[PDB]
Curated annotation (Swiss-Prot):
Disulfide topology: none
Function, as annotated: Immunity protein that plays a role in preventing early activation of toxin Tse6.
GO MF entries: toxin sequestering activity
Name recorded for this polypeptide: Immune protein Tsi6
Pfam families: Tsi6
Gene Ontology BP annotations: protein secretion by the type VI secretion system
InterPro entries listed in its UniProt record: Tsi6
Disruption phenotype: Deletion mutant cells show Tse6-dependent intoxication with a dramatic increase in division time.
Length: 94
């Protein structure tokens, strides 16, 4: 229904993994992203176009492919919806 939820979910899964690896460049790199997609989601004046420029998930799908699929799957979908919203496109997936 809303992207805020999709990204909100991953935020919870990330916390768990982070606990095991307190100081991962890939974790923070992907986490910090979720913060942007969420910020812009509420912000109107802030930069939104960047949502399309960003590219989170390509690293998680490879690095966190088997090690942490719950995060990768959530990330790939997190930015996915973000891009559309960034421009104002409809959202709806199976």
């Amino acid at each position: 229904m809303t992207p805020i939820e999709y990204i909100d979910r991953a935020l919870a899964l990330v916390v768990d993994r982070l606990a095991r690896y307190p100081g991962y460049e890939v974790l923070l790199s992907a986490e910090k992203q979720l913060q942007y997609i969420r910020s812009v989601l509420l912000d109107r004046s802030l930069d939104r176009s960047a949502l399309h420029r960003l590219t989170l998930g390509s690293i998680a799908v490879k690095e966190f492919d088997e090690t942490d699929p719950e995060l990768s799957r959530a990330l790939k979908d997190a930015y996915y919806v973000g891009i559309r919203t960034g421009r104002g496109l409809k959202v709806d997936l199976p």
